[PDB]
Amino acid sequence: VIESPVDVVKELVENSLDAKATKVEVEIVKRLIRVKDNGTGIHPEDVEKVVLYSISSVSKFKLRSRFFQEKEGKEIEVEAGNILGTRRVGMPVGTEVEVRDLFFNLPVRRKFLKKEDTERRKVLELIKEYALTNPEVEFTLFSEGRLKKSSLKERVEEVFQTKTEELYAEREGITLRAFVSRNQRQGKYYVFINKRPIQNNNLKEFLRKVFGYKTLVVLYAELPPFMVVNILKERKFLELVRELAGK
Ligand code: NA
Ligand code: NA
Structure with missing residues (x-):
């Protein structure tokens, strides 16, 4: 252990x-x-x-x-x-x-x-x-x-x-907040779903595409009844992430 x-x-x-x-x-x-x-x-x-x-x-x-x-x-x-x-x-x-x-x-x-x-x-x-x-x-x-x-x-x-720009989006049960800074030397994409950190590479690449590369993106998600690697009801989550990357 x-x-x-x-x-x-x-x-x-x-x-x-x-x-x-x-x-x-x-x-x-x-x-x-x-x-x-x-x-x-x-x-x-x-x-x-x-x-x-x-x-x-x-x-x-x-x-x-x-x-x-x-x-x-x-x-x-x-x-x-x-x-x-x-x-x-x-x-x-x-x-x-x-x-x-x-x-x-x-x-x-x-x-x-x-x-x-x-x-x-x-x-x-x-x-x-x-x-x-x-x-x-x-x-x-x-x-x-x-x-x-x-x-x-x-x-x-x-x-x-x-310094960071704060973004907020909420739909159905899902609530998510992002903190983004666009000038970074290296892009760094942090994801926390509820309070648990998520290392998923596919999700980080989705953030690379939707917020652009070479950007700092700190994502905080809140959902009530889900699993945790972890699974959820994915399509609405991801198009929410797109939606708030539209500021
Ligand atoms: Na002692
Ligand atoms: Na203790």
């Missing part, structure tokens, strides 16, 4: 969000993964139990959590799934997790790990997907320096460092 550091930060950030956090701070060094949390935190009683929620606790793992109605907070150090110890720790309400030397104990899986720059790009892409999906949540990413963005509405412009 883990296989690489982007899957670690994915599990930890997903947990942070389920914990109702409005601020997520991710740090990587290429090896440390650290996810700091704004959320409800974990009862001291439950910290051991949740360390055996989080497995990926088998690589050199440390977690501290303070529950929002508790005043202390609790830290547990485990190594390759073996608890090394615990201590009570002063800290703000929330959760911090440090992963540190992923697959130190499993050399063959450690040798599956890519170049450090590749893993850095996978993490960066994941964090910007979470940001583009959650405008109301602050996100921060530390690689060596700082990546940083706050509560917003159009954070598309912050993420992609460009």
Whole structure:
């Protein structure tokens, strides 16, 4: 399930969000993964139990959590799934997790790990997907320096460092919004159907044709009862995408 550091930060950030956090701070060094949390935190009683929620606790793992109605907070150090110890720790309400030397104990899986720059790009892409999906949540990413963005509405412009034209179209159940910037050096086409990102190549080429190439297109779709690769009732969706590319 883990296989690489982007899957670690994915599990930890997903947990942070389920914990109702409005601020997520991710740090990587290429090896440390650290996810700091704004959320409800974990009862001291439950910290051991949740360390055996989080497995990926088998690589050199440390977690501290303070529950929002508790005043202390609790830290547990485990190594390759073996608890090394615990201590009570002063800290703000929330959760911090440090992963540190992923697959130190499993050399063959450690040798599956890519170049450090590749893993850095996978993490960066994941964090910007979470940001583009959650405008109301602050996100921060530390690689060596700082990546940083706050509560917003159009954070598309912050993420992609460009101004954008906003387009809106709605028909039957389908609601979709686009953010487009036409001068780009390279075209980049991002699609989110509901909150889930869609990597489909055919759809991206349809956006290349309908909004033109060498353009940034960020598409947000909302539909109620559909599948998710994913299927829907396609013709009306696609001619809606054409319709709002007609501004
Ligand atoms: Na958590
Ligand atoms: Na400890």
